[PDB]
Amino acid sequence: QLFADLSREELTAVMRFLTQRLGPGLVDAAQARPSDNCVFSVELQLPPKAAALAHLDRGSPPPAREALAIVFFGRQPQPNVSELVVGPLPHPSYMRDVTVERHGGPLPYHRRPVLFQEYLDIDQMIFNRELPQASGLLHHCCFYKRNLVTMTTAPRGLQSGDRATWFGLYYNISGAGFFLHHVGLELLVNHKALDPARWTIQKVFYQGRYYDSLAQLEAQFEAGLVNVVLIPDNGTGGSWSLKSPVPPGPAPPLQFYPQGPRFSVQGSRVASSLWTFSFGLGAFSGPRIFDVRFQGERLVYEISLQEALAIYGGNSPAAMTTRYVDGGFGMGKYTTPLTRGVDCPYLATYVDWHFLLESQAPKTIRDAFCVFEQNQGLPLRRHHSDLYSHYFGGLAETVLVVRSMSTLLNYDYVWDTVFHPSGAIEIRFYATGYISSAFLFGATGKYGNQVSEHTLGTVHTHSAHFKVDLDVAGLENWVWAEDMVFVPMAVPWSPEHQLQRLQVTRKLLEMEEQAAFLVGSATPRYLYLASNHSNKWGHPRGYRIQMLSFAGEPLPQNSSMARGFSWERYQLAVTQRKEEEPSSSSVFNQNDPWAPTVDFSDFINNETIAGKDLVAWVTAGFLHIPHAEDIPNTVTVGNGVGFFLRPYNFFDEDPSFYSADSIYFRGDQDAGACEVNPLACLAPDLPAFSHGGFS
Amino acid sequence: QSQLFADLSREELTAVMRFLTQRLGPGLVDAAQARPSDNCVFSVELQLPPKAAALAHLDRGSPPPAREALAIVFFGRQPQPNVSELVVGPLPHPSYMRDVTVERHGGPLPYHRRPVLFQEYLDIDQMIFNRELPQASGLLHHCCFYKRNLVTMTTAPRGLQSGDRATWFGLYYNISGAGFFLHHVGLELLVNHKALDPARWTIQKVFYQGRYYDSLAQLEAQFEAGLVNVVLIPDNGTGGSWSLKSPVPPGPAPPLQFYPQGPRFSVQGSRVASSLWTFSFGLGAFSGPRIFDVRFQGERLVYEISLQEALAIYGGNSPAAMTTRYVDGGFGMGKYTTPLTRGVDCPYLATYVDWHFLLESQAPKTIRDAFCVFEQNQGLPLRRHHSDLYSHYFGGLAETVLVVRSMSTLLNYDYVWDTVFHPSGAIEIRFYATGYISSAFLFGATGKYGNQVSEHTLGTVHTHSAHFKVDLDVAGLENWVWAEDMVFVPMAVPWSPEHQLQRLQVTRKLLEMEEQAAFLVGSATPRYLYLASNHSNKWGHPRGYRIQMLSFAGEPLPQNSSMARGFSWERYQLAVTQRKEEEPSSSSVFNQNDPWAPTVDFSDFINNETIAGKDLVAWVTAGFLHIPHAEDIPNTVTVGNGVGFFLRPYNFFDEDPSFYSADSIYFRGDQDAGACEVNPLACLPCAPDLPAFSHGGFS
Numbered sequence A: 001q002l003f004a005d006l007s008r009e010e011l012t013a014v015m016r017f018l019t020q021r022l023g024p025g026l027v028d029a030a031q032a033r034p035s036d037n038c039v040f041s042v043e044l045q046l047p048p049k050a051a052a053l054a055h056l057d058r059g060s061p062p063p064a065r066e067a068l069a070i071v072f073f074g075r076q077p078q079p080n081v082s083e084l085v086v087g088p089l090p091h092p093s094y095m096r097d098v099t100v101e102r103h104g105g106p107l108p109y110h111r112r113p114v115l116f117q118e119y120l121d122i123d124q125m126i127f128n129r130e131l132p133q134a135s136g137l138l139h140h141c142c143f144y145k146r147n148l149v150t151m152t153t154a155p156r157g158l159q160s161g162d163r164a165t166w167f168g169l170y171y172n173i174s175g176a177g178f179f180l181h182h183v184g185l186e187l188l189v190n191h192k193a194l195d196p197a198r199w200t201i202q203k204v205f206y207q208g209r210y211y212d213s214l215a216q217l218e219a220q221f222e223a224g225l226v227n228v229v230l231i232p233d234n235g236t237g238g239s240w241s242l243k244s245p246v247p248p249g250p251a252p253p254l255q256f257y258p259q260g261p262r263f264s265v266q267g268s269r270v271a272s273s274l275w276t277f278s279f280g281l282g283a284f285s286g287p288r289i290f291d292v293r294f295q296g297e298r299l300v301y302e303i304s305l306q307e308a309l310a311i312y313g314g315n316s317p318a319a320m321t322t323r324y325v326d327g328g329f330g331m332g333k334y335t336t337p338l339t340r341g342v343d344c345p346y347l348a349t350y351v352d353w354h355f356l357l358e359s360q361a362p363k364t365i366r367d368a369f370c371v372f373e374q375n376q377g378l379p380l381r382r383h384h385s386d387l388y389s390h391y392f393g394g395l396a397e398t399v400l401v402v403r404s405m406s407t408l409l410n411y412d413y414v415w416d417t418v419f420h421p422s423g424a425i426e427i428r429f430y431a432t433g434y435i436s437s438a439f440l441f442g443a444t445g446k447y448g449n450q451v452s453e454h455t456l457g458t459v460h461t462h463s464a465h466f467k468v469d470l471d472v473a474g475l476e477n478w479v480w481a482e483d484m485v486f487v488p489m490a491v492p493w494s495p496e497h498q499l500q501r502l503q504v505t506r507k508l509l510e511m512e513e514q515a516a517f518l519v520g521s522a523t524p525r526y527l528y529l530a531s532n533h534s535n536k537w538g539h540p541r542g543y544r545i546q547m548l549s550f551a552g553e554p555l556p557q558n559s560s561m562a563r564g565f566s567w568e569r570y571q572l573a574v575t576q577r578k579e580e581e582p583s584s585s586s587v588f589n590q591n592d593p594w595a596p597t598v599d600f601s602d603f604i605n606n607e608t609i610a611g612k613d614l615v616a617w618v619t620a621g622f623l624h625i626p627h628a629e630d631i632p633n634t635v636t637v638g639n640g641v642g643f644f645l646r647p648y649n650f651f652d653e654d655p656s657f658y659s660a661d662s663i664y665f666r667g668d669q670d671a672g673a674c675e676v677n678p679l680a681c682l683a684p685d686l687p688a689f690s691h692g693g694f695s
Numbered sequence B: 001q002s003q004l005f006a007d008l009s010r011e012e013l014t015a016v017m018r019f020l021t022q023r024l025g026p027g028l029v030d031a032a033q034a035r036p037s038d039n040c041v042f043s044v045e046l047q048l049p050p051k052a053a054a055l056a057h058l059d060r061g062s063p064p065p066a067r068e069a070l071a072i073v074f075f076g077r078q079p080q081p082n083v084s085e086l087v088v089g090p091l092p093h094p095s096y097m098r099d100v101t102v103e104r105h106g107g108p109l110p111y112h113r114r115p116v117l118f119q120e121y122l123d124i125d126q127m128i129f130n131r132e133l134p135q136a137s138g139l140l141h142h143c144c145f146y147k148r149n150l151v152t153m154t155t156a157p158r159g160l161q162s163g164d165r166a167t168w169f170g171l172y173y174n175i176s177g178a179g180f181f182l183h184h185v186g187l188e189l190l191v192n193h194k195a196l197d198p199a200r201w202t203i204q205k206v207f208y209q210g211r212y213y214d215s216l217a218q219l220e221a222q223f224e225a226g227l228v229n230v231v232l233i234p235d236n237g238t239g240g241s242w243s244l245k246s247p248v249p250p251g252p253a254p255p256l257q258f259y260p261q262g263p264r265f266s267v268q269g270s271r272v273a274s275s276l277w278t279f280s281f282g283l284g285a286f287s288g289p290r291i292f293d294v295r296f297q298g299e300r301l302v303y304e305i306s307l308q309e310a311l312a313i314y315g316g317n318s319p320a321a322m323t324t325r326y327v328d329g330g331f332g333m334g335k336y337t338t339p340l341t342r343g344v345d346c347p348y349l350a351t352y353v354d355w356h357f358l359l360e361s362q363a364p365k366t367i368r369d370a371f372c373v374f375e376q377n378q379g380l381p382l383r384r385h386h387s388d389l390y391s392h393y394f395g396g397l398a399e400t401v402l403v404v405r406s407m408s409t410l411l412n413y414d415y416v417w418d419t420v421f422h423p424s425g426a427i428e429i430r431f432y433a434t435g436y437i438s439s440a441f442l443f444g445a446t447g448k449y450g451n452q453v454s455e456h457t458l459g460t461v462h463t464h465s466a467h468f469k470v471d472l473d474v475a476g477l478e479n480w481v482w483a484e485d486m487v488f489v490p491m492a493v494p495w496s497p498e499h500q501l502q503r504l505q506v507t508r509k510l511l512e513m514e515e516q517a518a519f520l521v522g523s524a525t526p527r528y529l530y531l532a533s534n535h536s537n538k539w540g541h542p543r544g545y546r547i548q549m550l551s552f553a554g555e556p557l558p559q560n561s562s563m564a565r566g567f568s569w570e571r572y573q574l575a576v577t578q579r580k581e582e583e584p585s586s587s588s589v590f591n592q593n594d595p596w597a598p599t600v601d602f603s604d605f606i607n608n609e610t611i612a613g614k615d616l617v618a619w620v621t622a623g624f625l626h627i628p629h630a631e632d633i634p635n636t637v638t639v640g641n642g643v644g645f646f647l648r649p650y651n652f653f654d655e656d657p658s659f660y661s662a663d664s665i666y667f668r669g670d671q672d673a674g675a676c677e678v679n680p681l682a683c684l685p686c687a688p689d690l691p692a693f694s695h696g697g698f699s
């Protein structure tokens, strides 16, 4: 299993090694202060592609199996973040610092994600030292005494090098989302200092007005210059609960496998009579799929989530300057247990996921993946003939699915990899869970809708970026753009007459820039990566990229931070796959987008894409103005974005023709005979329910 | 109350047919074998009630409107032949008949606009195979195993200007147990069948494997004179292009869906009801699928959602393919509806429903299992949230959905029409195209007109597009249309003036005139576009439903085409007009055979009228470009081809209705999630006996 994420054992063994090589003074990241040395991340380092294909397709031995550790080196004159590759696994022997090799220099220490212990320190400051200075105001507005909690925001500051975060204050609602109860107080905390003692509060926001400290605010209030409204800290309805007041009814439909599962899961490889592939989670990039072979032939080397991005508006400071680059938190790191029956079909197969993050010992997110077959209740294809000959032929589409979900504070991102029996691959991304809210005060008409009492549903956009490493019939691929045109010309057999003549238009895209399409501008209706090899009928074997996106307007290029997610400007882009261009974002962009650790636009640089090993990059998104129907959560309906990889002259005929599940009968046959029709042929056992728990 | 939108039953149909039989002075012929000269009843079907009367009944308890039928009659025997639309009296037992043709059209219906009768196709095949084709027995005998082992297939319009009735017929190999559409032999006849006397029918042009001739005689001449390079096309073989039956034996069973504790919806007539939804469904003979009186938890959302038309515009180098614009309503999406194979077309345990029609006949007939209704478990959460933060809990709900499906098989393609009702209050309309592709003989510079797909088989390039009528009555009849969207406003950071920030804002515009809310294909449309009441929800926003389009529309036929006003709805992604009784449909069964003189021209509905505070109706066009490829053989698959739209609630409610779901799951960390009384799912761990498989048969 070349692409399997690191096991608990491998994780442990690399942490063992790291502790030896870094002579103590090394602290457990779970309790580390800024000036300490700690291990932040330890996870699988993906192998180089050539070495891997060598192994998979030519017997050649397995590329060394290595880990990548992210270390916070704060205990030194010039602190920094280092990426260290760790030696041959199962039993590590070397350690290699690749930081400069990759970035050209050190990683500025301020790009390091805010540690859990850091958030904790920030809270101690706010709750123990800063808030009690306004115990007057906070008593008359927010039942102060703790009853409140904080939620961090986007990039932290305004220039490269800043580490100042706007926090909102929310009623600490129990058993339900606190995100819907902003109490109207927002704090700009400056925690750039290595000594948490020197941490200050640069700004304060309350009801439309800014102050320089809480004392200054508490002042204006004791001076009777601030009007306070007692925000209720309790209620009933969707705003306050997630539990339905309605008794359970008869159960929803259930799918089972009459003659047992028709696929198997072995570690991280999945196999069905049609598909074999590997799956996993990057701690920061999230879901990924490797070595996808349809009936033994490889279509894609890699499909992987690169980044998720949320961009906000609002009439409060926190909201209006919020741009989450979710990889900076980690789609994998924040993956949550799948609730059997709700998040996946009850009889799905559920797999665990192991990680060493902000810790010194491995941990496991139980039931992190689900794999299952799903009857779509829909024909993959069908024809019914009443004309000339009486026959029916069709096939009910069943689909193979791998899924994980990431809960980043509020939102719960659902990541779907769907394998169709037609030879097609579908990548879906559903955004559910809670919205972010602001306190409703002022002229909120331009920044969202009132979505509850005191609650503003702030306008925003969601986008995600995907890496699509297709290797259509080998590595050397070309990209084609086919479309249509009408050409007015005389009717051959009656030349006085005209006719708008429909024509196909093909165009080879030979330079990276030609296959870079921007959000906003139109893209060709047919776009695919081809080999020079042809199918039986002499057409380039190709796989077509079809996008499902309602992408909202991307953050303006003029923004000094826009280059921390330059991929958001592109619908689709295609480039030469390079070992040095592994991902299009980085865990280090979130905290310093002004000095991006990777800038996707760098990948598009006047190179040829004619006959190379290419890699496609797809962006999918939508705009979101919140409405009442988002209370409790936002629903998945309509907000599914992503793309299809559809075969296009790749095969000689539709592979599903050879399906073991296809149905066919003529008029002169007994369609109710089981030897004519398998449908005419012929008490699920259900495991005890169990939940992954919490942390 | 009354089941007001139900399609006519067999006896209702019989009753109307009998009533007409009498009052149409004898000579009336059974249309199933009528000639152009005869008088015959072409179709008899339900006439939808006027909206005012219908709502008065449904809402204010008024008496229900008279139940009427509409009959289309072909009046062939007379000096000035014509098509007439007749409404037939009060129904269980009719007593009146009225002619509404001039009321609806301002004059008579020119007789050439009438669809081609099945008997007419028969006579054409007579003139072809009995009087013309033998004039070339030589060529035919050499190239195509000739010796009626061949079949014809009709095409788009029938001519080049208003009044023409000349069809191009491709000739194919009569394959068996599989589509003949893939085996074009290269011969294409331009049959002129305008004349009322089929003896006077001529062949205006001939096309054979790349070349034009003036008759099959001239082509026969040139053949035996050794002057035609004939390409031999095999008349059978093996593979997907010759079969549809899988050579592979059945494996382990596919997944099966069942309802553990009984069904959770009920069909009674044409009306469906679950705990969240009630609606009525049916098929227009020509317009196809339709939904009426949709109510979510008791409240009406849409008065009507109905298919209006289906289009197919082709290219190619053969004259048939090259000039083909199907306006499928001209054949009829209901008329060509087909039985649903249980287990394939719908879940096995779905509820199936028959459909009754009187079409080109004199006795009612039934399509068995024409509709299916079922709950489907999407295998996807509708909503969910796992909280590890501050408070430990999980709250979620697996989306189960309510579906009504019918398919129309129009010659080669099978269109699957979906109507999907989500537990969130949303309505999803889907349209999948599957079945066989229309093909041409492969010869020439095929590059600009499609891909080679089998030996000798060119998959011709074409566009698809369906038109949908969405009469939303959002919180009452009076609606307005809103366009909301985003914008970035560069400004200075309010707390750090020498710094810049791109301020994200919402933009709300009221579209007040029909034109402001008409969006052509190719121009940009508001990300948020919705119809709303002027009544507010609990939080004082306009109660609205938004229209989210799922379309990859191709280039609409250029306006400079004299025939483009036969489907001018193709040029619009979306439009919103005042709803009018006299604007019932955006197409017509009569547009197909005279798109140059359209019976209805959808563009007329957009005429500088207010759409502020009126009974509004939205029109939605979904479609896409299709360049056929190898994976379209034998049929084109449904994956990725689903077009249509969502109707999504936007401040219509005060919170998400699914909060009150009976199926929602929730448990705190400090609870046993494996205990029944906290988690219904735990109480899960019998399956039903299955009904014996039965199928609906053929014609």
Ligand SMILES: *[C@@H]1O[C@H](CO)[C@@H](O[C@@H]2O[C@H](CO)[C@@H](O)[C@H](O)[C@H]2NC(C)=O)[C@H](O)[C@H]1NC(C)=O
Pocket: A146, A147, A148, A149, A172, A173, A174, A175, B390, B391, B392, B670
């Ligand atoms: C936020 O709300 C949760 C809800 O209970 C609080 O949870 C408790 O915190 C106290 C503090 O020690 C624990 O003793 C309780 O047992 C926790 N209860 C359970 C059932 O979760 C939470 O602590 C509040 N957090 C703060 C920091 O405000």
Ligand SMILES: *[C@@H]1O[C@H](CO)[C@@H](O[C@@H]2O[C@H](CO)[C@@H](O)[C@H](O)[C@H]2NC(C)=O)[C@H](O)[C@H]1NC(C)=O
Pocket: B024, B075, B078, B082, B083, B084, B099, B102, B107, B108
């Ligand atoms: C269309 O054809 C019908 C049938 O001939 C015409 O209807 C007849 O019209 C004459 C005079 O109006 C009447 O005597 C018959 O009673 C009518 N028969 C029926 C069933 O209505 C009809 O008038 C023609 N309409 C026009 C506009 O041409």
Ligand SMILES: *[C@@H]1O[C@H](CO)[C@@H](O[C@@H]2O[C@H](CO)[C@@H](O)[C@H](O)[C@H]2NC(C)=O)[C@H](O)[C@H]1NC(C)=O
Pocket: A388, A389, A390, A391, A666, A667, A668, B148, B149, B150, B151, B174, B175, B176, B177
């Ligand atoms: C076209 O092909 C079909 C072959 O399947 C022929 O249909 C059969 O015709 C015979 C009579 O000759 C019937 O008894 C069979 O029932 C038919 N089979 C089916 C399933 O319908 C058909 O005769 C041929 N007709 C044409 C126009 O060529």
Ligand SMILES: *[C@@H]1O[C@H](CO)[C@@H](O)[C@H](O)[C@H]1NC(C)=O
Pocket: A476, A532, A533
């Ligand atoms: C390149 O294309 C040729 C035909 O142009 C094809 O036959 C061959 O397989 C390809 N050769 C490569 C990719 O080295």
Ligand SMILES: *[C@@H]1O[C@H](CO)[C@@H](O)[C@H](O)[C@H]1NC(C)=O
Pocket: A606
């Ligand atoms: C791109 O590279 C080519 C060299 O192959 C060069 O001729 C051309 O000028 C370059 N274009 C730009 C825009 O730099």
Ligand SMILES: *[C@@H]1O[C@H](CO)[C@@H](O)[C@H](O)[C@H]1NC(C)=O
Pocket: B534, B535, B613
């Ligand atoms: C809706 O608008 C009409 C008139 O344009 C008005 O008379 C009615 O009172 C309005 N309802 C409101 C604003 O709630």
Ligand SMILES: *[C@@H]1O[C@H](CO)[C@@H](O)[C@H](O)[C@H]1NC(C)=O
Pocket: B608
């Ligand atoms: C449309 O009607 C308005 C009156 O409300 C009038 O001002 C305008 O001139 C008309 N426009 C056209 C194109 O007829």
Ligand SMILES: [Ca+2]
Pocket: A301, A469, A470, A471, A472, A475, A577, A613, A614, A615
């Ligand atoms: Ca590749």
Ligand SMILES: [Ca+2]
Pocket: A512, A575, A576, A602, A603, A604, A605, A606, A607
């Ligand atoms: Ca490059």
Ligand SMILES: [Ca+2]
Pocket: B471, B472, B473, B474, B477, B479, B579, B615, B616, B617
């Ligand atoms: Ca309306």
Ligand SMILES: [Ca+2]
Pocket: B514, B577, B578, B604, B605, B606, B607, B608, B609
């Ligand atoms: Ca109008």
Ligand SMILES: [Cu+2]
Pocket: A431, A435, A460, A462, A624
């Ligand atoms: Cu959102």
Ligand SMILES: [Cu+2]
Pocket: B433, B437, B462, B464, B626, B636
């Ligand atoms: Cu098609």
